[PDB]
Amino acid sequence: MQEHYQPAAIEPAAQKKWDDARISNVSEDASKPKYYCLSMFPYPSGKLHMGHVRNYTIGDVLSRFKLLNGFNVMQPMGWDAFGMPAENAAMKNNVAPAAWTYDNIEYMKTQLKSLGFAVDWEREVATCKPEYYRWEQWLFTKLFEKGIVYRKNGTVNWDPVDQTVLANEQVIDGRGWRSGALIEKREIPMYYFKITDYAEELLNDLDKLEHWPEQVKTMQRNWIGKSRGMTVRFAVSDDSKQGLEGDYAKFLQVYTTRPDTLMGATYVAVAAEHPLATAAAADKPELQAFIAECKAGSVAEADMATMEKKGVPTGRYVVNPLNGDKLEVWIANYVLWGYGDGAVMAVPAHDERDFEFAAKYNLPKKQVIAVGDNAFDANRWQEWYGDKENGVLVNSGDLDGLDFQTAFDAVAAKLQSQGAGEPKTQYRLRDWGISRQRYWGCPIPIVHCEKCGNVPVPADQLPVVLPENVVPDGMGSPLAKMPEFYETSCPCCGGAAKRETDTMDTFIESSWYFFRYMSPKFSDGMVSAESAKYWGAVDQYIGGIEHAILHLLYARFFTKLMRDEGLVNVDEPFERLLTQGMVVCETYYRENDKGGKDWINPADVELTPVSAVLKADGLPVVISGTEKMSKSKNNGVDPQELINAYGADTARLFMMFAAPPEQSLEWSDSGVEGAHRFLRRLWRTVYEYLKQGGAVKAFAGNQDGLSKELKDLRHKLHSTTAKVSDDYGRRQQFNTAIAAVMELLNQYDKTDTGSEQGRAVAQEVLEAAVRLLWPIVPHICETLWSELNGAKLWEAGWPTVDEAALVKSEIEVMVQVNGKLRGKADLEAAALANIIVVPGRLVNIVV
Ligand SMILES: CCCCCCCCc1cn(CCC[C@@H]2CO[C@H](COS(=O)(=O)NC(=O)[C@@H](N)CC(C)C)[C@@H](O)[C@H]2O)nn1
Ligand SMILES: [Mg+2]
Ligand SMILES: [Zn+2]
């Protein structure tokens, strides 16, 4: 055994030992319990970043832990390959997105292999290959014929300078984020998944997920946004009907979740597109201007609640069906056409948004709920104003004194008897628009024929292959400019026809890839029945919190769609969910000519602990704040530089020790060095142990007869095994597991292990320590284990707790006063807490 730890000389050998043993290449072996551990697969963007290394090290720790516990562990990796990154790189570099993508995959794959992740590379998928995306085209066609996928006109943000469609997030003050041109609202036909048909199942099935973080489930519930409310119809006042047709001339229908407060409504509000808004605005320029502003907004959903709420009065009035009040109709920017009826009532005394709106416009606030003897102040919102549980109705006529549920039913009764309303369930959830006007994505398998309509491509003709010999130029979506792609014959009649040229939302590929891993070469279906039956669901899913709403909702939805098609047997794709925190780093810059900043990458900087300077010249830089690693402030630390300087195990150890997985992980030069020094210490501890006599049989069995010092070390050892097992298995807090092994090594360092029994215990300590750390730093532990013991580390298995090492050897002593037993220097103090002391047997209190 070499004296000094050298990662470069042991990490490739360990990797070849694992590869040759095919330990990570798993099959559907019915004789070993399965465990499916999945880290969210990466976009092949070019090179790994620290977020990747953190994520996949966490996944590898859990996978290797389960492997040592005897599970048949599938840990697959693949590439989420479609999307805008490659399209832009193409525009920037004059290369095909496919060529850029495949070169990135090859490079990043080598990087992942160099980190020693126990990955089943025979299950690799790349979502941009027709062998993958043919199956989501297949599902699309099946659902399209059932109406679960449908085609409908929708409104998009069109950027006329860049000639591209923009998400709301890419619109800044009504202008495209890159072009700076005013965007145009355009109506275009698009394809939608009818995910609202599954809203109730997606909501209720969250309750099954006892091993999901409660905040992820709360976010999904709020996103789905089910409410149980009341449709209420306010008759349009006789003076307010000009310009109105049909039922819009008769009543204004609203939806409310608080019909118990209907007696306290003081105005109503409609969307900009509502017919009452249109009729009121016909002669009123301020209203026309307000409506135009509302229609031109592009506020992202994440920002909707934060936008300033504004409205304009219409001079039109409706009548409250309960109390007969005439209420003015307002147009408001927070009422969205297409949600419910596009009209709401307002109760400013008991809804905080209505309170602030009414406070702004000096609209009335009417208390109709009381909570105890709490004083109501119309001028200041109090939390109890919105309480639904502990209030009773006041100022509500014959409804006074009722609680929420009784008042709800009473109002429903009154409204239904009048014909003025009825209970109604609503969902915030929108259907999922999947059309993208982009080239680098899965083609939509539709052919447009003027005789037959929008025709799904037959299953025998799938895939619709995306041509890879394309370099986007930026002047519009390439597929629409390629008649060699879109000109075709109709599969139903043989006539002239055109292929759909929009591609699929790339969330589609990540909504089912976890099933494709189960049989990635299966050519007769999305996933083979035998594989789906064996692997079932993902046991452990690991990924970033930014995917907690959309990706997870879509994956759950696709799972239920595939279940209903008879392809899988589970209702939910992911049993346990671990969401990792971001990686952050200090920022540095040097000053600018126009009073700005230009940002320096950390690896090009050297500190002095006073100031910092640039490595190339040694001139001063300015240390700035710490924030998430990104190209924006050039504070990404390249993991390849970390691996080149210290090796894979140091990178993995630092990532796992620096913070618990959910916490933000702060890049630290000294922390990286400390991780490396600990691996050197581990190496030296084993080297020095073996140099004093070589390996012996590890201590096992009855420890009666061991010295106290060695009993104490065995107690620490099995205490540490218990802690580490609970940290890996239950708490998923790997930093504390590492610290526990460090404390064990500290106690070992202070214990004399030179005797025959001491060497047996030292062997037991070191054999446990290297297996406890193997999930985290497998290369060095594999190597050290081989010097300690001739068995296959993965066949020795996870260390077992010896409960006998955890019980302490007590001796029962009799106590007596004046020679008569009255119960049963250290022993003197206990018998007084109960003086001749016959050592260990008798203590006598000279009364
Ligand atoms: C090189 C110059 C730039 C430096 C950048 C530094 C970034 C540091 C950072 C980032 N973050 C956020 C979490 C990142 C997780 C990383 O690993 C997985 C794959 O990320 S991906 O490739 O972006 N693919 C995806 O997120 C999707 N393909 C997953 C699909 C299942 C939907 C996911 O779990 C992610 O959530 N924290 N620190
Ligand atoms: Mg359960
Ligand atoms: Zn046809």
Query: Which secondary-structure segment (H or E) carries 530?
Result: helix 529-535
770 with 817, same domain?
no
Question: 722 and 784: one domain?
Answer: yes
What would the DSSP string read from start to end of 29-97? -TTS-EEEEEEPPPP--SS--HHHHHHHHHHHHHHHHHHHTT-EEE----B---SHHHHHHHHHHS--H
Per the CB < 8 A criterion, the answer to whether 713 and 747 are in contact is yes
Please, what sign has the CA dihedral across residues 247, 248, 254, 255?
Answer: positive
- Residue nearest ligand 1's atom 13 by CA: 544
On whether both 693 and 794 belong to a single domain, the answer is yes
* Cα dihedral across residues 104, 110, 115, 121: positive or negative: positive
Using CB atoms within 10 Å of the CB of residue 281, give its burial: 0 to 12 exposed, 13 to 18 middle, 19+ buried. Answer: buried
483: enclosing H helix or E strand: helix 483-486
Task: Spell out which residues line ligand 1, taking CB within 6 angstroms.
Answer: 40-43, 47, 49-52, 55, 80, 510, 543-544, 546-547, 551, 582-583, 628-631, 636
The protein residue whose alpha carbon is closest to atom 10 in ligand 1 is: 51
Query: What is the C-alpha separation between 733 and 725, in angstroms, rounded?
Result: 11
Per-position b or e across 528-541, b if 16+ CB within 10 A of its CB: beebbebbbbbbbb
Complete DSSP assignment for 353-381: HHHHHHHHHT------EE-TTPPP-TTS-
Contacts by 723-727 with C-beta closer than 8 Å and gap 24+?
A: 724/772, 725/798, 725/801
The residue range of the domain holding 660 is 628-806
Instruction: Choose among 787, 572, 551: nearest CA to 3.
Output: 787
Resolution (A): 1.9
Residue 834 has which token pair? Answer: 């109960």
State whether 679 and 786 are in the same domain: yes
Question: Rounded to whole angstroms, what are the CA distances from 100 to 87, 92, 272, 365, 469?
Answer: 9, 11, 46, 61, 12
Helices 639-646 and 648-658 pack at an angle, to 10 degrees, of 120
For residue 390, give Cα distances in angstroms to 231, 315, 369, 373, 384. Answer: 24, 37, 9, 12, 9
In testing the pocket of ligand 1, which one of 37, 38, 47, 49 has its CB within 8 Å of the most ligand atoms?
Answer: 49
CA 43/CA 105 separation, integer angstroms: 9
168 touches 185 (CB < 8 A): no
Tokens representing 135?
A: 């199956």
Nearest protein Cα to ligand 1, atom 14? 51
301 φ, ψ (degrees, to nearest 5) = -60, -45
DSSP of 159-171? ETTTTEEE-GGGE
Centroid of ligand 3 to alpha carbon of 357 (angstroms): 55
**Do both 747 and 840 map to the same domain?**
no
- 662 shares its domain with 745: yes
Query: Ligand 1 centroid vs 582 CA: distance in angstroms?
Result: 9
Q: Identify whether residues 679 and 792 lie together within a single domain.
A: yes
Q: How far apart are CA 156 and CA 138, in angstroms?
A: 27
Task: Please list, in sequence order, all residues whose beta carbon lies within 8 angstroms of the beta carbon of residue 771, skipping any fewer than 6 positions away.
Answer: 68, 781, 785, 793, 796, 798, 799
Find the 575 Cα to ligand 1 centroid distance in Å: 21
Q: Kindly give the distance from the C-alpha atom of residue 653 to the centroid of ligand 1, in angstroms, as a whole number.
A: 20
- Sign, CA dihedral 563-568-571-577, equals negative
Cα-Cα-Cα-Cα torsion 552, 554, 557, 561, nearest 10 degrees, comes to -130
Query: 620-628 and 583-591 as β-strands: parallel, antiparallel, unpaired?
Result: antiparallel
Give the CATH number of the domain where residue 696 resides: 1.10.730.10
Atom 18 in ligand 1: residue holding the nearest Cα: 40
Beta pairing partners, 295? none
Indicate whether 825 and 746 sit together in one domain.
Answer: no
Torsion sign (Cα): 387, 389, 394, 395: positive
Experimentally, the structure was elucidated by X-ray
Specify the amino acid at residue 730: R
Within 443-547, strands assigned E span: 446-449, 453-456, 487-489, 496-499, 503-504, 538-544
In the reported structure, the alpha carbon of residue 445 is separated from the centroid of ligand 3 by a whole-number distance in angstroms of 15
Q: What is the rounded distance in angstroms from the CA atom of residue 50 to the CA atom of residue 747? A: 34
The neighbouring-strand residues paired with 816 are: 821, 844
In ligand 1, the atom with minimum distance to the C-alpha of 46 is 1
CA–CA separation, 602 vs 588, rounded Å? 7
What is the three-state SS of 657-680? HHCCCCCCEECCHHHHHHHHHHHH
Substitution site in 58, 60, 80 for ligand 1 pocket (most atoms within 8 Å of beta carbon):
80
Helix (H) or strand (E) holding 575, with range, is strand 574-580
Segment holding 197, helix H or strand E: none
**Ligand 1 atom closest to Cα of residue 631:** 3
Cα-to-chain-centroid distance, residue 533: 26
Backbone phi, psi, residue 171, to 5°: -115, 120
- The C-alpha atoms of residue 206 and residue 192 are separated, in whole angstroms, by 23
Q: Which of 714, 704, 711, 708 is nearest to 767 (CA)?
A: 714
Q: What share of the chain is helix, strand, coil (3-state, %, to 5)?
A: 40, 20, 40
Looking at the chain, how many residues does it have?
847
Residue 830 belongs to domain with CATH number: 3.10.20.590
Strands 149-159 and 72-74: unpaired
* Other Cβ atoms closer than 10 A to 30: 9
Rounded CA separation 575/79 (Å): 22
Count CA atoms closer than 13 A to 423's CA, side-chain side: 12
Cα of 525 to ligand 2 centre, how many Å? Answer: 29
**Locate tokens 């201007």: which residue?**
289
Contact status, residue 216 vs residue 210, Cβ threshold 8 Å: no
Structure-block tokens of residue 472 = 């986007």
Strand, helix or coil at 146? helix
In the numeric block, the tokens 């064990």 are attached to 744
Same domain, 706 and 815: no
Question: Is the domain of 821 the same as that of 841?
Answer: yes
Q: Of 32, 10, 36, which Cα lies nearest the Cα of 797?
A: 32
Whose Cα sits closest to atom 34 in ligand 1?
Answer: 543
| Ligand sitting nearest the alpha carbon of 448 | 3
Are residues 800 and 819 located together in one domain of the fold? Answer: no
Task: Retrieve residue 262's tokens.
Answer: 């209907």
What is the β-pairing status of strands 267-270 and 435-436?
unpaired
557 Cα–ligand 2 center, Å: 19
CA 566 – CA 532 distance, rounded (Å): 11
CA nearest neighbour of 366 among 403, 306, 325, 420:
325
Torsion angle defined by CA atoms of residues 818, 819, 820 and 822, in that order, rounded to the nearest 10 degrees: 70
- Asked if residue 463 has a cis previous peptide bond (ω within 30° of 0), the answer is yes
544 contact partners, CB below 8 Å, separation of at least 6: 40, 51, 55, 579, 580, 582
Query: CA 330 → CA 62, 237, 320, 406, distances in Å?
Result: 57, 14, 15, 30
CB 356 within 8 A of CB 309: yes
Question: Are 635 and 711 members of one domain?
Answer: yes
- Closest by Cα among 336, 337, 343 to 265: 343
For residue 443, what is the DSSP state? B
Q: Tell which residue, 502, 447, 563, 514, has the closest CA to residue 123.
A: 514
